[PDB]
Design a protein around this ligand. Sequence first.
Ligand SMILES: Cc1cc2nc3c(=O)[nH]c(=O)nc-3n(C[C@H](O)[C@H](O)[C@H](O)COP(=O)(O)OP(=O)(O)OC[C@H]3O[C@@H](n4cnc5c(N)ncnc54)[C@H](O)[C@@H]3O)c2cc1C
Ligand SMILES: [Cl-]
Length: 488
Amino acid sequence: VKNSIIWFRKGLRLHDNPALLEACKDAKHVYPVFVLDPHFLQQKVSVNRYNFLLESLEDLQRSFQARGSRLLVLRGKPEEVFPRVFREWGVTQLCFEHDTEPYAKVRDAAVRRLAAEAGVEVVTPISHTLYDTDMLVARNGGAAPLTMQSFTKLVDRVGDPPAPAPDPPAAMPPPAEDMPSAAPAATGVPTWQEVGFKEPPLTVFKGGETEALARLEAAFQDPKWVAGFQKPDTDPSAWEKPATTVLSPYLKFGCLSARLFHARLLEVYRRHPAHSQPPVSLRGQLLWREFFYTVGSTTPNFHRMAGNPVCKQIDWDDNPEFLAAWREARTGFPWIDAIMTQLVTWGWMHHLARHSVACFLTRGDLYVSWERGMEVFEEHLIDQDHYLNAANWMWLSASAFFSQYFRVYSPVVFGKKYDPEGRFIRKFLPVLKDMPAKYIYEPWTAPLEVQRKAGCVVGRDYPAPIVDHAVASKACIARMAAAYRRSK
Ligand SMILES: Cc1cc2nc3c(=O)[nH]c(=O)nc-3n(C[C@H](O)[C@H](O)[C@H](O)COP(=O)(O)OP(=O)(O)OC[C@H]3O[C@@H](n4cnc5c(N)ncnc54)[C@H](O)[C@@H]3O)c2cc1C
Ligand SMILES: [Cl-]
């Protein structure tokens, strides 16, 4: 008989899941498993993203119960849990979605060896990315493209991505009862207070495949907005109704299928001939994700500066004071401090909002390494993706892909062109709520008489700007110009 396990790591969804489909076929029992490490908070992880995963597990649990099944959240390390349940459950097949992250390769290669000794067939279809990334590299001549222009020419030569896999059956083969390691008391979906966190999450985006599909249909309700989407023209200050899809946390965890997203976009494009093209279109946004996955999975030390052959070696400053002020949203620039407050409360910011704080920390003002800023985003971003966070931090620091280090965003003017009244600043920095709009971006320029009436005296309620932007930017550009010469 066939008893199989569908191991969830990414791909927390039932739609477009070829690993689930293979696990249920001709199977008498199916064991849906997520492997949790209860000592994860003991070694980095804000409660905003960890609860987003827990909410995603509760969504899989309810979807499995409605099909006569149950989600099994096992505790411990994978290599120490699977050899036990392989024999206990009589497993003959193990299926999980292929991942290309560094820890994933060394982890899944060990689980494959443990399954081989147990006589367990391993099936690992590709469904997290649009394409087989190793196939794109093979078709390009054995090397990943380093420009988006060439990458777009490659995927259009390859053709369309595979269509989304059909939905699973209405009822699924259930796990065998009275199995000890599958007891409900030891295989439940925990909450955030149970895993060590002591402060509740404040993010407004709830996890789960159902929330992913609900936000998907929300974006596609205006088909002309989807067809004419241009990423650089979106508004970073819009928070009540974000100017972009806000599907990044659901794509990172696999709550939403990228191949379903791409398939729905083509349906619109076929009925809208003047639709936008890459790299500014919505489809182009998915190809940016596919671009960085293709390069990141083929570049050693892609998350570091040293040993990274694609990254430029720049003499960044070791400045804890500048990092601590930038990390704690006390820079003195309301536009920057507000985006860093949205980071720690929501775990998500608009793409150009991340441009402002990444440029300010790296090549624009403080000249701190992008690795330090990536570590901060890794803690708070609910969409933190190993290959996307690193690639865009290297982009913004002009260390890879992007080299126009003369383009420096102003922490004063960049937000003014979208939000002159500064409602984005007043929302996330309520201390500046009563400041007139003339000084909302430069409160230190307000007269003392006005600062006292707003309840916001600079230096007492809101800090003074840590640096003069005109002085700091002129120094960073010169240091980058020296580095870009030293780099030959
Ligand atoms: C410093 C910095 C760090 C970043 N770290 C991450 C990260 O860890 N995880 C992450 O998902 N994105 C990251 N990005 C990219 C980008 O800011 C977000 O992907 C985007 O803002 C998410 O909003 P959205 O889902 O509405 O995107 P949309 O504009 O609606 O795009 C849809 C999808 O396309 C993908 N996408 C969009 N822009 C990019 C991009 N520039 N690079 C790669 N994929 C993209 C995402 O999967 C996103 O869900 C980072 C950007 C910066 C500047
Ligand atoms: Cl600007």
